[PDB]
Design a protein around this ligand. Structure first.
Ligand code: OM0
Length: 489
């Protein structure tokens, strides 16, 4: 058996946009992502599926059923976000004594008076509804990680169609320090309203994906779909500052831990000559970000400086992991290889003979041990696995995927890394962004016609793990690669 510490918690992660809508009066039309997925031109281009989030699994209405199932499964931790748009649907006045043309945002003053001023603008019905969801969650003995941001922005902060068209005269999302300023006040406001329910905070979920797919990986159909290396750099600079100001904002109202959740790949060498390529990829995709918000180290105008307003702004690291990236050294740097990791055919095998998911992602659990131990060795900050799962409507691979990845967290703990929990993506099927509803990540299958939840066999396997706090002897054989001979090639 592989037994976890008594303090370690098994649970799940979920996003508001992906899971909330689908029931009565749940509809939230006031985000960039809502406009983006309803846009006629985005649909004709196939950038978005044509599926709509208001036909979703209905957590907004059916949360007691979600939480009933989580408690039956033995889960002890949940990570959820509030949707900014629900709380502040309407434009806030531009502040006096704040210049938008300054690159750096080193301070956002927040006090009781500023927060009481914000009350005037807040949707009380949304705040009360979230409080009802979170009290129900705590009443099941679920430890609660509250995340402030899981990709949609209020429309009054980002009109993504204007940006896609190459008009930058409107609300421009993370390209604007206005969004940094308002995000810090938002995060403080939520901690001021919810701190009695919350155990730990995250500022953001995978801000690297938002910028990377929004401004470079434009075939993904992520907003605003404007191809620019320069704007992707400006996004990531503003994100770092937004995180630091949100951290300071939360710490002004709360003494609880404040972390961040970030999308990781395990970088792997194509041959034994590509070890430097792996280190260059880890620098470009991971360390430059974490060195900024932990060590205050950043490159601005070709110079390596330390920003005092950025240093020390992190208490924990949320590791989000699903596959590897294979790299090789080039004359000018390194390249990622197709046919491995996230660049595979759907429901096939990779170039290494490993099975791929419904989304074309390669089975590679050892990468999770690589990412957890690398983080630990560089920063010695404690971690949660805040996201790990697989697109698998049939449930063929998910039992192997679940037990294999849980084993790798046990391995990381055994090597000395401080990992405090594992949160599967996700409890139930949900709206997979530009892909819509066809990509099914749930331990629970959703009938979208009725909103009924069914237990996939992997949910029974996870109940074994969570109720025993271990991979039990009976299920240890699932620590293995799904057999490929019976699967599609
Ligand atoms: C993490 C992952 Br992996 C998925 C699947 O694409 C998203 O649904 C989720 O919002 C991301 O945070």
């Amino acid at each position: 058996m592989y037994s976890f510490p008594n303090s370690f918690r098994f649970g799940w992660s979920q996003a508001g946009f992906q899971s909330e809508m689908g029931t009565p009066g749940s509809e939230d039309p006031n985000t960039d992502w809502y406009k983006w997925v309803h846009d006629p031109e985005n649909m004709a281009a196939g950038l978005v599926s044509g599926d709509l989030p208001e036909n979703g699994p209905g957590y907004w209405g059916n949360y007691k059923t979600f939480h009933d199932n989580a408690q039956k499964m033995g889960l002890k931790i949940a990570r959820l976000n509030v949707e900014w748009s629900r709380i502040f649907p309407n434009p806030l006045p531009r502040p006096q004594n704040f210049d938008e043309s300054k690159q750096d945002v080193t301070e956002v003053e927040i006090n009781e008076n500023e927060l009481k001023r914000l009350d005037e603008y807040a949707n009380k019905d949304a705040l009360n509804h979230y409080r009802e969801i979170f009290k129900d969650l705590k009443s099941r003995g679920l430890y609660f990680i509250l995340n402030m941001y899981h990709w949609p922005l209020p429309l009054w902060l980002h009109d993504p169609i204007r940006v896609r068209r190459g008009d930058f005269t409107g609300p421009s999302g993370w390209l604007s320090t206005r969004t940094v300023y308002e995000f810090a006040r938002f995060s403080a406001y939520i901690a001021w309203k919810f701190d009695d329910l919350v155990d730990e905070y995250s500022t953001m979920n995978e801000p690297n994906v938002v910028g990377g797919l929004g401004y470079v990986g434009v075939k993904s159909g992520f907003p605003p779909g404007y191809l620019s290396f320069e704007l992707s750099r400006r996004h990531m600079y503003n994100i770092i500052q937004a995180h630091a100001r949100a951290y300071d904002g939360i710490k002004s109202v709360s003494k609880k831990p404040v972390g961040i959740i970030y999308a990781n790949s395990s970088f792997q060498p194509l041959t034994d000559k590509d070890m430097e390529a792996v280190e260059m990829a880890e620098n470009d995709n991971r360390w430059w970000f974490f060195d900024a918000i932990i060590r205050g180290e950043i490159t601005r105008g070709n110079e390596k400086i330390v920003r005092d307003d950025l240093k020390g702004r992190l208490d924990w690291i949320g590791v989000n992991y699903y596959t590897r990236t294979v790299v090789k050294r080039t004359e000018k740097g390194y390249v990622s290889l197709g046919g491995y990791g996230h660049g595979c055919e759907r429901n096939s095998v990779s170039l290494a003979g490993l099975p791929t998911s419904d989304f074309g992602w390669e089975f590679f659990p050892e990468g999770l041990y690589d990412v957890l131990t690398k983080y630990w060795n560089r920063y010695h900050l404690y971690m949660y696995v805040t996201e790990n799962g697989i697109a698998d409507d049939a449930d063929y691979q998910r039992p192997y995927y679940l037990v294999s990845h849980v084993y790798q967290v046990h391995r990381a703990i055994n090597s000395g890394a401080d990992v405090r929990g594992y949160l599967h993506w996700s409890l139930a099927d949900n709206y997979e962004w530009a892909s819509g509803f066809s990509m099914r990540f749930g331990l629970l299958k959703v009938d979208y016609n009725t909103k009924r939840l069914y237990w996939r066999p992997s949910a029974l396997v996870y109940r074994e793990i969570a109720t025993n706090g271990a991979i039990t002897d009976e299920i240890e054989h699932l620590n293995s690669v799904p057999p490929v001979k019976p699967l599609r090639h």
